[PDB]
């Protein structure tokens, strides 16, 4: 499993996106396009932009 941390807040605009807060711990499901699929601490999933998260 790969953990990434949110660099910035992101507000979901589409049902398949995920709301994230800066410094939130996330798990990376798919990094093969510019929408990255992530999972949060409560096992909700969705897409966030690649530039919003990084491996610490």
Q: Percent of residues in beta strands?
A: 35-45%
Structural class: mainly beta
Secondary-structure element series: EEEEE
Number of strands: 5
Helix content: under 10%
Number of self-contained structural domains: 1
Number of helices: 0
Specify the overall morphology: globular
Using only C-alpha atoms, the radius of gyration works out to 10 Å
Distance between the termini: 14 Å
Q: How would a textbook summarize the main sheet?
A: 5 strands, antiparallel
Strand order, largest beta sheet = 4-3-2-1-5
Subcellular location: Cytoplasm; Endoplasmic reticulum; Nucleus
Domain SH3: 1-56
Protein name: SH2/SH3 adapter protein NCK1
Folded structure, characterized:
- It is classed as signaling protein.
- The chain is mostly beta strands.
- It has one domain.
- It has no helices and 5 strands.
- It has strands at 2-6, 25-30, 35-39, 45-49, 53-54.
- It has a 5-stranded antiparallel β-sheet with strand order 4-3-2-1-5, with no helix packed on it.
